[PDB]
DNA sequence: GACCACGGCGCC
DNA sequence: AAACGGCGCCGTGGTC
């Protein structure tokens with residue numbers, strides 16, 4: 382390309398180099414733009430951002446987030462990554478996309494700008510005739526990137542002093558557990574080492590091995606294996622408790638307070654738009670989509686996620702979303718009727734599991750039922766949920782029978798989905814998002830059947846993902862008008878931050894927007910709560 | 921110091 | 933672990 386002085390014309394494709402991958406923490410090392418056979422290199426990157434009308438090109442959201450960080454209202458526009466991801470969700474990296482669609486991902490901003498221009502031209506051409514994918518791009522993915530950029534730049538407040546105090550307390554309990562484990566082992570060792578633990582349990586203590594690990598075939602020390610050995614030796618329970626505490630402390634309690642941004646005083650994640658095979662988002666650096674909530678200590682950690690002073694968090698959560706989606710996709714009368722009657726499958730299953738009336742089902746019991754309901758739906762074995770429920774194999778067989786027999790058209794939709802998948806080479810969501818599954822025609826059964834479970838799950842999980850994305854795009858401008866903030870997305874949950882005076886109105890509006898985003902054969906119901914912290918806002 | 925595979929596990 | 937699906941991060945063991 383012909384070198385030309387900054388600034389570039391309108392509609393130019395940007396290229397840029399960051400000191401690190403996280404846009405909220407990155408230094409803008411270089412900035413460039415390409416248009417009309419010319420490349421414009423910015424002598425002064427930060428000031429040059431002001432000359433841009435939009436961030437158009439590869440990883441557009443990243444540059445936009447950095448711009449927002451610097452108080453510049455620069456929205457992301459066209460991004461070849463989004464086009465490639467829609468064509469094939471295995472297109473997740475700019476390295477891969479460049480190689481596949483015409484270029485090479487380098488470390489020079491000018492070459493990145495030129496690459497962005499070429500890739501877009503080529504990828505836009507491949508979207509010719511793909512009207513459903515084109516609809517997803519224009520109406521969902523492209524505007525969503527703008528929404529996500531604002532969310533990333535906003536961040537969420539965290540009670541740092543609380544977590545630091547909690548760390549000291551957990552450390553003392555960990556010390557008690559590890560000391561007991563070493564005593565019971567008869568000698569100290571690296572309890573964090575599963576290799577050393579394996580030898581202690583199975584060679585020294587002579588406990589029976591239950592399972593083997595996948596890649597190397599070692600005797601597994603997983604929680605599922607330990608759960609089976611809970612009554613064989615006192616050391617097992619102590620290890621399980623050590624596992625829980627060290628997991629939470631090393632993953633959340635200790636790292637998170639060190640990740641507070643010095644300018645915003647808040648915690649900033651990244652919402653990756655081209656990272657999953659189903660169309661779901663992912664969250665990273667740090668992952669805020671896996672904040673603990675199951676155990677007491679876990680809930681204690683979730684409490685650290687708080688609203689700004691004078692504000693309140695609003696948590697909105699779709700009700701039984703994939704089951705409702707399944708009802709629409711399959712068209713099963715029995716399942717549709719269940720949601721028309723306003724029933725709760727999770728509660729009903731949980732009542733059966735613990736053998737109690739459905740009014741005696743606590744949140745923890747209902748949570749466990751989700752493993753059973755979705756597990757069985759997506760192909761869990763009779764042997765597994767017999768171990769999950771600690772019931773005889775024969776009973777576990779019977780549950781799987783009645784589950785599918787209650788909803789006959791579900792199995793029909795699955796068989797239809799798999800056959801179409803074999804013929805076309807891909808499955809699709811309700812809106813036409815695709816996932817290629819070539820292993821549907823594998824001659825090895827274990828491989829073929831594994832692919833099948835991936836294949837028929839994708840339209841269900843993906844449709845729910847499409848619906849949430851659409852809801853986010855619609856909801857965002859409404860929130861901006863109300864002075865409320867969209868903070869987090871957790872797959873089928875949104876976390877908002879609103880002024881105390883407007884909290885209830887925001888909750889009501891967001892609920893209605895989410896419920897009426899795209900009507901199905903069954904009503905979409907959304908549970909909403911308001912609180913000073915994340916945990917309180919979901920109760 | 922970084923990167924890796926692995927086992928393991930937090931969430932949806 | 934076991935024929936649930938979808939993610940990212942932890943420490944270990946290991947290389948470079």
Ligand SMILES: NCCCC#Cc1cn([C@H]2C[C@H](O)[C@@H](COP(=O)(O)OP(=O)(O)OP(=O)(O)O)O2)c2nc(N)[nH]c(=O)c12
Nearest residue numbers: 698699700701702703704748751752755756759873932937
């Ligand atoms: N396994 C430990 C127990 C907690 C859990 C969970 C799961 C959730 N999902 C998918 C299906 C849900 O529709 C979607 C949202 O998760 P959710 O809100 O927790 O569950 P749901 O929306 O069905 O219940 P609720 O929101 O009405 O309480 O994520 C799952 N999908 C699969 N294949 N397996 C799962 O375990 C889960």
Ligand SMILES: [Mg+2]
Nearest residue numbers: 687688690913
């Ligand atoms: Mg407060």
Ligand SMILES: [Mg+2]
Nearest residue numbers: 698699700873
């Ligand atoms: Mg939900």
Ligand SMILES: [Mg+2]
Nearest residue numbers: 698871873874
């Ligand atoms: Mg949820």
Ligand SMILES: [Mg+2]
Nearest residue numbers: 925926927928
């Ligand atoms: Mg792994």
Ligand SMILES: [Mg+2]
Nearest residue numbers: 576926927944
């Ligand atoms: Mg290992």
